[PDB]
């Protein structure tokens, strides 16, 4: 393919043909035959035009040639030259792009290569074009057909025929004659007639003021619309304006001022698992992977007083919940985990059926009966409540951003670094894991991901029977000891359907130590028992069980498993921060940002407020806060949080412009604020984001004056 093209044609012809083919074909390499045809056509054109010369008055010998080569050049310039020639010489411009233009008769020329014979492709070209331009036809076999007598003479004919004959012989003797394609196959299709229905559709699709499509076409083709825009802008109403105003600091007001109102309810806890109040039953192991049922069995054996408690000491009750059935299901879970059977199925369908409310579902009827029945009305939408700030979100963020004694992250290795960029990445990863390994949020995230993946695996593998999914997690401490942790048990419902969005009920029992009565408004969805006490470092602590009936779907299970990408997201945010810091300089600032060089001191970040005063921290603490923020954004994610995050970005960029003194201008500030505040209804993360935004905005306003 490319070998013969390179050998038989010069570089300039080959590259020109390649460009011409690439202009309309996006896969030039996949069809070399078109390249062959284009290069042969270009060579023939050059043969016709390269040698034939002219002069000033009439001499067909200066440097003036009688042929202009319009082929082999970009269409953008070829069309310009063609139109310029047509206008200068007072001749009509053909609707197609010509290959050559003759200066002795001032007529565009079409040249084709006919594999079969001349006088047949000639008439096809005539039909395609007509009287617009002349034709010069040459065939691989010795033959020609010209539309003019004063056109190309015999001398050029000999060279072009010899050029074609050499290629024909080479193709014949190199088995590539089967790849040759005629120009008729490329010309295929010029007879497109419009039927009656489509024409009528065209007639009625014209803008206002036109009778049929023909009037619209003629008006477009013949009218000069110069000055129309200014004409229509002159008579446009002044009320149509962007109404711009120069933004100031005073124009920035707190968002969602109803969160401060105390008469509203406070947001409850609604995440799938206890994030910061979780309690895990640690059991040392040698690191060998165990089936989750065995892990739960051993962790329950290590704590016998909790496994063997058979009587509920109820502490709190959800208004609907049926604490007796919840406790009976919990006992069933604990008894099925400890059995000798190799299955985690709850064969006792009674309490699982009666706890998930599966017996209180709606059923379908015929549409005719519903139409007749006047009592049937479409339900009103569930308007989200308007809640206020809850201090437990602040406490949860505070705790999840601290360092624990356990780590749940164990990532594999990668090839050795050889490039400076790879060394930069390795250093950044080293610092990131050093700061995030023992963070509480990291272990919580790994627990979330493991729970969701376990749910999904059990969901579609065995959907028809109630399974119990231990809420487990493997962690390691600074001494290299590998502990198996059990945070609770989660009986998973069963869905009669098999769709991906179908809801499955998952009742979760989670251990804890925090007294639910200290923050009563946090746990309206939970029934809390008291199972026993525990000793950790010589101090006794109570143990509670948080039962809750929840629902989810395969889509949400996959979303929860994918929640692990918060690690990559935090890594990328740290990378962006470090890259921005280094862009001021020319060199990487990872070490200086984290550890601090001789010229650069360690970077301190603003982390929070203590009695209304700013408190600074290290880049490690800020990294932990970033990771916690990403984790909570993923955990508390819904449409409201999505919209709030998307919309508050514009306000944040406006504050950035104000800080940089870039003189921002706003066209609808109240519209911006309304768009931001329409998403603050009941999401704990959105409400806390609004509270934090207002506090930070107050700090920024105070700082701007100085």
């Amino acid at each position: 393919m490319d070998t013969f093209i390179t050998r038989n044609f010069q570089t300039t012809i080959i590259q020109k043909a390649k460009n011409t083919m690439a202009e309309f074909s996006e896969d030039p390499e996949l069809q070399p035959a078109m390249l062959f045809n284009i290069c042969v056509h270009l060579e023939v054109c050059y043969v016709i035009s390269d040698m034939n010369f002219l002069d000033e008055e009439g001499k067909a010998y200066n440097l003036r040639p009688q042929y202009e080569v319009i082929e082999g050049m970009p269409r953008t310039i070829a069309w310009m030259v063609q139109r310029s020639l047509a206008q200068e010489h007072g001749i009509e411009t053909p609707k197609y792009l010509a290959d050559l233009f003759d200066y002795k008769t001032k007529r565009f020329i079409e040249v084709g290569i006919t594999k079969g014979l001349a006088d047949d492709y000639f008439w096809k070209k005539k039909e395609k074009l007509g009287n617009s331009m002349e034709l010069m036809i040459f065939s691989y076999n010795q033959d020609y057909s010209l539309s003019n007598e004063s056109s190309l003479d015999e001398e050029g004919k000999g060279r072009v025929l010899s050029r074609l004959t050499e290629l024909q012989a080479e193709l014949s003797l190199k088995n590539l004659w089967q790849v040759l394609i005629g120009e008729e196959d490329v010309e295929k299709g010029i007879d497109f007639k419009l039927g009656q229905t489509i024409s009528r559709l065209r007639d009625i699709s014209v803008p206002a003021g036109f009778s049929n499509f023909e009037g619209m076409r003629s008006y477009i083709d013949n009218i000069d619309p110069k000055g129309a825009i200014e004409r229509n802008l002159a008579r446009m109403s002044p009320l149509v304006s962007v109404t711009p105003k120069k933004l100031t600091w005073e124009d920035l007001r707190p968002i969602g001022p109803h969160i401060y109102n105390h008469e509203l309810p406070e947001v409850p806890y609604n995440a799938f698992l206890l994030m910061s109040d979780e309690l895990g039953l640690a059991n040392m192991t040698e690191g060998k992977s165990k089936k989750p049922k065995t892990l739960a069995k051993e962790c329950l054996e290590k704590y016998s007083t909790l496994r063997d408690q058979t009587d509920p000491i109820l502490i709190m009750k959800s208004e609907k919940a049926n604490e007796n059935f919840l406790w009976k299901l919990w006992r069933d879970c604990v008894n099925t985990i400890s059995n000798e059977e190799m299955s985690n199925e709850l064969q006792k369908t009674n309490y699982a059926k009666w706890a998930t409310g599966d017996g209180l579902t709606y059923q379908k009827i015929m549409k005719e009966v519903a139409i007749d029945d006047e009592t049937m009305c479409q339900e009103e939408p569930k308007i989200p409540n308007k809640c206020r700030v809850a201090a437990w979100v602040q406490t949860e963020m505070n705790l999840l951003s601290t360092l624990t004694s356990k780590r749940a992250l164990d990532l594999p290795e990668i090839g050795p670094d050889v490039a400076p960029v790879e060394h930069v990445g390795s250093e950044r990863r080293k610092y990131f894991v050093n700061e995030i390994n023992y963070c509480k949020a990291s272990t919580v995230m790994m627990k979330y991901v493991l729970f969701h993946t376990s749910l999904l695996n059990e969901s579609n593998a065995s959907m028809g029977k109630y399974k119990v999914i231990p809420i487990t997690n493997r962690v390691v401490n600074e001494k290299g000891e590998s502990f198996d942790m059990l945070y609770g048990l989660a009986v998973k419902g069963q869905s009669h359907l098999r769709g991906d969005t179908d809801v499955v009920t998952v009742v979760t029992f989670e251990f804890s130590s925090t007294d639910p009565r200290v923050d009563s408004g946090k746990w309206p969805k939970y029934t809390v028992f008291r199972i026993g006490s525990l000793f950790v470092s010589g101090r006794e602590k109570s143990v509670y069980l948080y039962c809750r009936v929840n629902g989810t779907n395969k889509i949400q299970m996959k979303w929860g498993m994918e929640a692990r990408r918060c690690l990559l997201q935090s890594m990328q945010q740290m990378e962006a921060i470090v890259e921005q810091e280094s862009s001021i300089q020319g060199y990487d600032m990872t070490k200086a940002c984290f550890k601090g060089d001789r010229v650069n001191s360690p970077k301190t970040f603003s982390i929070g407020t203590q009695e209304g005063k700013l408190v600074k921290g290290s880049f490690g603490k800020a990294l932990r806060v970033i990771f916690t923020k990403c984790l909570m954004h993923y955990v508390f994610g819904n449409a409201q949080l999505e919209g709030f995050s998307a919309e508050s970005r514009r306000l944040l960029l406006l504050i950035q412009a104000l800080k940089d003194r870039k003189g921002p201008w706003v066209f609808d500030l109240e519209g911006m604020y309304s768009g931001i505040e329409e998403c603050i209804s009941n999401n704990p993360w959105v409400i806390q984001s609004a509270y934090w935004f207002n506090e930070w905005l107050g700090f920024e306003k105070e700082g701007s004056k100085v």
């Binding site: 960029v421 999904l456 862009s583 001021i584 020319g586 001789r598």
Partner: protein, 611 residues
Amino acid sequence: NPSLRMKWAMCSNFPLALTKGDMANRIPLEYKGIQLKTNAEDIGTKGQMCSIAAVTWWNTYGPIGDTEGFERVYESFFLRKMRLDNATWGRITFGPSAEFIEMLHCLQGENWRQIYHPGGNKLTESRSQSMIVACRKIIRRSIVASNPLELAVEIANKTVIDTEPLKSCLAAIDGGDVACDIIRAALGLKIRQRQRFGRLELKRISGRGFKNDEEILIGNGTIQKIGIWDGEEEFHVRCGECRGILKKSKMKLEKLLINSAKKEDMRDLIILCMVFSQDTRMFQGVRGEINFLNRAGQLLSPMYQLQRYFLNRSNDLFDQWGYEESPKASELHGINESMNASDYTLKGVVVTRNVIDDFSSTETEKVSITKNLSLIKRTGEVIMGANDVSELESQAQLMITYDTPKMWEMGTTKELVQNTYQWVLKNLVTLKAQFLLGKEDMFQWDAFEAFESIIPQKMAGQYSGFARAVLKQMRDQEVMKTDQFIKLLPFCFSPPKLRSNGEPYQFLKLVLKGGGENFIEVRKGSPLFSYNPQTEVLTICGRMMSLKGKIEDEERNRSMGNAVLAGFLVSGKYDPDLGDFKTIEELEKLKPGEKANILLYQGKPVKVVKR
């Protein structure tokens, strides 16, 4: 869900289709109780199946087919690999050919750029390339250490390229770079005398200069203390394959005559020439921050700061350099900012047709090298230094090996451990003899200095205290076990970090850089350290090596529980009365004189007592 479906299929028994034929039938029906292929005859399809275990068995014990011509079929991939290995990596900078598109992921980001010079089939001069690579690596190691000259000489004498000592290549090979010249002067050899400014080579041919201290304002608006040269001077300047003549005066570049050569070489020469000329016109082009540091963590001198900046951001200077019209003489030409032929040439710069005779006339001499790898002639003027060493990095074409622990840090943290343990073993007799004398100086050896570089800093002191306490327990109050002495000796270098109680920190494993599999188990066979009690073999990273003779008869009956925790000695047996196996946290909190229970590994419980 292709991922989850694949997960389930791999959890199936026999998910993989298998062909029919003698080669297919060579797989056993079941291997060591694992069924590998289906022994079922399908009704109509007759399709046999197999497990992934079948694939693993084929790769483990399957027929060894011919693998000739494989590199011919996949020649493009191997060409890509060769280009990647033969490439040279420059510097990564942040802020604002088909062989370059391949590496695009590693070359261009959104805020960073990676300088990358691809290689391939440049094999003939391997000796010189390897000598340059080795000299650059030696210089890089030496700069970060106190008294760089001493370490440079001590590493240069113990390094060999292929088979010849580095000194032999330096003396024999006439080529090289700033690093090779620095090493030559360090070893006492002779080098060609040329003034250096980065890659720029300068040979004064006329004029005189008297550097004076002055305060200069740069474009960004900061005052810098720079030594400025006053007086008209001329130099013969070379950069790679491009040479020229430079006339300059106080804060001004007057003439710059050069020849035609590689575009990047021309650009580098011209930029270096402007920077050296100390023109105020290039002082004012500094609109950014000049705070670059060397790998030693020091601050570059102002001239090298400007050199680095204007080598990185060349347009910031060509914009603030002005332009002029070059004469229309045949030999005299003009070059624009893009190193092209254009009469709109830079102010004072002109490319010329006539050949400038190379200044590199044989000038071997004996320069004096200072502590900081700075070369000074008898007259007393610095000619070259560490700052001028190129920052390019590549892989030597000939195996270069350094026989010194100071060069172990260039390992993969697996070769470092291998070398440290082999060094400990080869000196086991003397090490043990010195330990059994009440002397602790062996912890300061250079091998342990190299080892410390892979122990995380946060836990280096704790590990050192733990290991030292365990060794002292093994020695004074008891007789030792050789294996654990070997295992825990490297960790003893760092100063102890005993807790407030005065006792050391107990550990179950000792972790190193690049974890996952790089850890040392204090009481078990880690992947980086294993030992067979009976066969007397130490498998360090799969390099089984015998221990005959060095072991003692009496240290075979002794249990392993006597040297697994500091301050704990074995007593009694596995008594299921105190409770379950205690965690290190409980052992640390245990009152003196109390017993406990321990699980050395799977099936070896033991009981210990505090002292």
